[PDB]
Design a protein around this ligand. Structure first.
Ligand SMILES: COc1ccc2c(c1)S(=O)(=O)NC(c1c(O)c(-c3ccccc3)nn(CCC(C)C)c1=O)=N2
Length: 557
């Protein structure tokens, strides 16, 4: 069937949207080429509608069913708990979109009786009714990039009351099942370093390693009614409370499979027969589905000792080469299979023979050296989007603070230590706002984070190594440098200078601020202070930071 059908009503915005980067007194210290940075808006959603709208054919064979049966056997070992209304309420982000039934995110969080009542009545309707399509809102995401212009991405989500019910029903499943079904292929169980560890061990466990990422064209749109029912039959394999079995079947029929789309104004826009981007099971379902399809395809294309790493719609395979000609021909077959399974490619896939060239989850493995001279592997990416967003966040307060997320996930990197950290700690000092907790996203989930805790976080996730890395590779250095010429970011000798000031200012405050100066900015000085383990390190509740994926699933931890 058709992924979408459209009545012709436009995708409308809530507030005014800004596409040109806002500029303040801090901007020029980061970025001169302001017109290179933009925010997508509802206004360009027609371009997106065009490309995500197509017909889907699907042809499922034995490799496909065999693997599905392998997955179900694992899922039948899983036991999920039905969350309480209160518990699901606590998992709602504070900035989550308000209900049309007259209550909001905070009324959910602080547990007001009006919100709890409506939620209960939504649950009860869910238990009694398994057919009635559930209303959803379609919006355009405001995201920020550098010119490469991309149309706004679409977000489709049900009402706040449904979103809470989803959590009651499925939060435990989507946190627990993916790991059991897909084992070490489940990308979201990994921190950055654990991911490098897995990619490196996988790579080097092959005689002659060949790897490739697979870029599906609009994964969401390629997901069919079949796919959604299949993944439901996977959820159903779990040991569940009778009320959870029921809610899951009903949410599958009324919501996950398809449903009407309403704009922010109340007008009807059309109908959806593919994955909704804004539901709880978005991450988990895409993952299970991508894995199911790629595992089968790898069999259909006779790939040798193939190892998969899956994150939502993001897929990378590492296997044994047969030479460039047989490798070239293996992937076309792999891609034909994926195509039959309704997962056609964007850019066709290309074999890589050097791990550092493999881009997956928008990151690559790279190498630098620790204080001992001991070669160390770490994860990095092209910093263009991180820096484009840092620019936006320099001038505008935002619901999610990506600069802080980028420091947590990309601490060992050159561009995150020398730029992100220097620039933003410089800003927090001027506002005296070091002690203030900020919101940031990790694998789709919102975390409230105190900047002063960064050293301990970084030590826990990356080891003291991360405060000592040096002699980065020429490929990494070049990309960072080339990215700065593009954006008009000051050269790295300026940031070193700024960082000496930023560090000394921090040392002066004493306490946590001086711990920040000592560890985050040790790189900046000629004669370095000695970095030992940190007393307060083993105090943070880092449980559930890298358990599962939650993107579009409206989750707060
Ligand atoms: C639609 O399916 C998805 C596919 C891929 C997804 C995600 C969803 S995600 O859960 O939004 N987060 C990430 C993700 C990040 O959010 C982030 C990230 C970046 C900056 C700030 C916070 C998180 N980083 N990486 C790379 C590092 C890890 C693979 C070790 C990511 O892959 N990737």
């Amino acid at each position: 069937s058709m992924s979408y059908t459209w009545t012709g009503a436009l995708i409308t915005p809530c507030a005014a949207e800004e596409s040109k980067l806002p500029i303040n007194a801090l901007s020029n210290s980061l970025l001169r080429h302001h017109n290179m940075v933009y925010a997508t808006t509802s206004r360009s959603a027609g371009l997106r509608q065009k490309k995500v709208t197509f017909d889907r054919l699907q042809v499922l064979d034995d490799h496909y069913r065999d693997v599905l049966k392998e997955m179900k056997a694992k899922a039948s070992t899983v036991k999920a708990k039905l969350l309480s209304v209160e518990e699901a309420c606590k998992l709602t982000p504070p900035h989550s979109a308000k209900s049309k039934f007259g209550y909001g995110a905070k009324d959910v969080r602080n547990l007001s009786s009006k919100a709890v009542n409506h939620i209960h009545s939504v649950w009860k309707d869910l238990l009694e009714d398994t057919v009635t399509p559930i209303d959803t809102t379609i919006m355009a995401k405001n995201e920020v990039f550098c010119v490469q212009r991309k149309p706004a991405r679409l977000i489709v989500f049900p009402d706040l009351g449904v979103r809470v019910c989803e959590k009651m029903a499925l939060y435990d499943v989507v946190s627990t099942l993916p790991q059991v079904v897909m084992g070490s292929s489940y990308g979201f169980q990994y921190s950055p370093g654990q991911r490098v560890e897995f990619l490196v061990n996988t790579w080097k466990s092959k005689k002659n390693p060949m790897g490739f990422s697979y870029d599906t064209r609009c994964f969401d749109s390629t997901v069919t009614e079949n796919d959604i029912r299949v993944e439901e039959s996977i959820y159903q394999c779990c040991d569940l409370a009778p009320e959870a079995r029921q809610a899951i079947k009903s949410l599958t029929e009324r919501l996950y499979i398809g449903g009407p789309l309403t704009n922010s104004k109340g007008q009807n826009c059309g109908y959806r027969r593919c994955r909704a981007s804004g539901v709880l099971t978005t991450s988990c379902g895409n993952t299970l589905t991508c894995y199911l399809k790629a595992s089968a395809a790898c069999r259909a294309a006779k790939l040798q000792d193939c190892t998969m790493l899956v994150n939502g719609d993001d897929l990378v395979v590492i296997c044994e080469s047969a030479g460039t000609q047989e490798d070239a021909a293996s992937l076309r077959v792999f891609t034909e299979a994926m195509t039959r399974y309704s997962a056609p490619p964007g850019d066709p896939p290309q074999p890589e023979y050097d791990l550092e060239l493999i881009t997956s989850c928008s990151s690559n493995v790279s190498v630098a050296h620790d204080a001992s001279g001991k070669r160390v592997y770490y994860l990095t990416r092209d910093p263009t989007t991180p820096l484009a967003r840092a620019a936006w966040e320099t001038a505008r307060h935002t619901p999610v603070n990506s600069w802080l997320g980028n420091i947590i996930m990309y601490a060992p990197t050159l561009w995150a230590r020398m730029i992100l950290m220097t620039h933003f700690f410089s800003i927090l000092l001027a506002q005296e706002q070091l002690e203030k907790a900020l919101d940031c996203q990790i694998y789709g989930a919102c975390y409230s984070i105190e900047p002063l805790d960064l050293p301990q976080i970084i030590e826990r996730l990356h080891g003291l190594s991360a405060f000592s890395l040096h002699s980065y590779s020429p490929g990494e250095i070049n990309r960072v440098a080339s990215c700065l010429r593009k954006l008009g970011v000051p050269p790295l000798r300026v940031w070193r200078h700024r960082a000496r000031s930023v560090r000394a200012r921090l040392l002066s405050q004493g306490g946590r601020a001086a711990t920040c100066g000592k560890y985050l900015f040790n790189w900046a000085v000629k004669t370095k202070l000695k970095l030992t383990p940190i007393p307060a390190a083993s105090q943070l509740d880092l449980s559930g930071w890298f358990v599962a994926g939650y993107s579009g699933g409206d989750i707060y931890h």
